[PDB]
Symmetry: C3
Subunit: 89 residues, 3 copies
Amino acid sequence: GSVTAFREALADHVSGRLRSMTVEAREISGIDVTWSEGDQGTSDYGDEYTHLPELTVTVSLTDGTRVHADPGWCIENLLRQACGLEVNP
Amino acid sequence: GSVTAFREALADHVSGRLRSMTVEAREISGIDVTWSEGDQGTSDYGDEYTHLPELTVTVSLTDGTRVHADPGWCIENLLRQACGLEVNP
Amino acid sequence: GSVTAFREALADHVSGRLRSMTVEAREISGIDVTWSEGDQGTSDYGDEYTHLPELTVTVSLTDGTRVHADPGWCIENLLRQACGLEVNP
Ligand SMILES: [Mg+2]
Ligand SMILES: [Mg+2]
Ligand SMILES: [Mg+2]
């Protein structure tokens, strides 16, 4: 039940973010998430730099399509399922 | 088993962060998570701005109460359940 | 099935990040995740400070070993399991 619902919810979610604009769950072949830590420094010559942390979720489709998902939506729906709540209301 | 435990753990968690200060699982009606990407820029007039990324988890109760949960606690307990470990020890 | 797979995947993951360099799932006794919000300010004397947000996942082993896991890998594999996809491919 929950895997059906989550897969359909993720497919609905990336359909809005994009072959057709509409994505089906069977097309979902992978998920990649990267967390980039922040960094702040100064070169030996005085140039300051600040790299803000980044969280990126990429969904890969069987046809090679790659589409970003919203990390907040992803975490929200993991928590909803963990609590027995409706996904992607 | 795991949904019971997670719901009770989240209710315990937000009870400490708040009708009574104590929240019950049946009261939990929604969860909202937002991820705000960082941003850095400069206006055309030279004003610099830096917006740090933000991760926010909001739990909604049937009585309209909204209470923030700690994002680290949330992710920790998702991982604990995924590993068969005790939640919210 | 999924708890077996997740536990084995996490053990494989931290084995690469470290008694032996290889970690077994039965050794995994805890997980701790902290989210540190960003902060930006200025002291009353003009010193600026900027603390970037941080997400840290620490796995604890029965022998007291503590090892950091990659937060992106963790979130990725939660999402993979939620979608019925292979973990840690
Ligand atoms: Mg960037
Ligand atoms: Mg803010
Ligand atoms: Mg630091």
